[PDB]
Paper text:
Tomaymycin is synthesized in Streptomyces and Micrococci by an NRPS consisting of the initiation module TomA and the elongation/termination module TomB. TomB contains a C domain (BC; TomB91–533), an A domain (BA; TomB534–1055), which functions to load the ppant arm of its PCP domain (BPCP; TomB1056–1141) with 4-ethylidene proline, and a reductase domain (BR; TomB1142–1535).
The crystallization construct comprised residues 1 to 533; however, the first 79 residues did not yield resolvable electron density, resulting in crystal structures of only the BC domain (91 to 533) and the preceding 11 amino acids. (A) Crystallographic structure of BN-BC at 1.7-Å resolution (N-form). As other canonical C domains, TomB80–533 consists of N-terminal and C-terminal lobes, which adopt a chloramphenicol acetyltransferase fold and are arranged in a V shape. The N- and the C-lobes are shown in light and dark green, respectively. The two cross-over elements—the floor loop and latch loop—are shown in red and beige, respectively. Also highlighted in red is the junction between the N- and C-lobes. The catalytic tunnel is at the interface between the two lobes and includes the conserved motif 222HHXXXD227, where H223 is fundamental for catalysis. In both crystal forms, the catalytic tunnel of BC is wide enough to accommodate the ppant arm and their substrates at both the donor and acceptor sites. The tunnel is ~38 Å long with a minimum width of ~1.4 Å at the bottleneck, as measured by CAVER 3.0 (29).
Numbering used by the authors: 80 to 527
The structure:
Amino acid sequence: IPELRAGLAPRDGRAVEASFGQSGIWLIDQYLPNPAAYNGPFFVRLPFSADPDRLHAAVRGVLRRQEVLRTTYALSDGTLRQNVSRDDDAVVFEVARYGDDKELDALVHRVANLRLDLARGPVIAVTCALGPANRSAVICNIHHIASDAASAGVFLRELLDAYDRLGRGLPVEADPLRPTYGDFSQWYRELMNPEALTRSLDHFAARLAGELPVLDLPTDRPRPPVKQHRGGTLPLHLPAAAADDFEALARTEGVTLFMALVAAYAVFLSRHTGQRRVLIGSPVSLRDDPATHELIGYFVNLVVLQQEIDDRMTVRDVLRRAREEVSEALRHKWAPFDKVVERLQPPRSSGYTPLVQTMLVLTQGDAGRISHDDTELRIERGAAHGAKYDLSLVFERDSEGLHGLIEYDADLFDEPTVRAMGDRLRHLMEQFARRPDAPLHELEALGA
Ligand SMILES: [K+]
Ligand SMILES: [K+]
Ligand code: NA
Ligand code: NA
Ligand code: NA
Ligand code: NA
Ligand code: NA
Ligand code: NA
Ligand code: NA
């Protein structure tokens, strides 16, 4: 994997082709809601009362430092291009007030429900929310084509740095030595040369050959002819003790926390659906190179994980099988998801996604929190989304430990059905940590 370098893309004004990820997203763009919440609009509670004029000036400084925020998109001769403008004020901005969490969440909903224009911009919105004494919040929506979950922490770190510099009368300008998203886009095209691309597409095409299962969860409603894009969320409420034993389980069995979550979720899906084979999508970060860690952009590729489950496997068996599947997938993680779909030529339907109908995410680092000025600031996500998937399981591990959230499609589910699912999943995860040797058929269902 070659290092990413600044200037790989022409610095002479010519528009770089959109990245593989961006191309996939632009082709989907209707005026639909954000497809998921975990990578969508976000806010941060600040322990001071931000000055609005200086905060707006700080935002302009972030636009100057983050070229993807100044990028719009257009087809030119059959190629989707990244057109970069010099307008550092291309942001949907407002100053508003809140006196309690309800009023703050109302401001969050207004930002979160914006439908930003990829051809004309802006591709970012920021609200400076002024709260009760010494409290304020920054609310932000960066279009999916221009961001990923980690971009939220990158944005806030850059914003707060700029706010502080401006306060001190210091300049806030682009770092010419940092690579751009345009540089990354060209680097990725060079990495996916014809041989390398064919090799990774060949891998998934073999792994995922034949008649793939379509997730068959019990639902409260049949899938409707007209999808309404109405996403819900519900906390998993995984006890802190079990969450800690689950992390210990992963460590002692020699798998990553993500591998163990994949395994537990696959057993949950297999039980609920009745299906032996289950497919789980996961958005894998492409920020391997430290040169990408301070950039806003779409540095993710969706991979498909296939698991087979039966009730004579042990907890340990399914952890080890998750380890093998995840290990092999991550080796081939640069093969763009939409090209995998194209190779597999799935039978696609309106409403249900290609290849995968559910996802599992583990939120880490800049997607969940930052430190600024020796203060830990949590990145909080809005709850509105378009329910691209039937269900998404979004996990995060903080100091109190690991916690989870279920993003779900309200076209299919009433909330008490999702609460029941979440109860069964957390129960399974607690059993995993207690009985790693047990055959799955000995892990009794909740309420037996
Ligand atoms: K519709
Ligand atoms: K980062
Ligand atoms: Na916060
Ligand atoms: Na707002
Ligand atoms: Na609720
Ligand atoms: Na079923
Ligand atoms: Na990322
Ligand atoms: Na078997
Ligand atoms: Na893609």
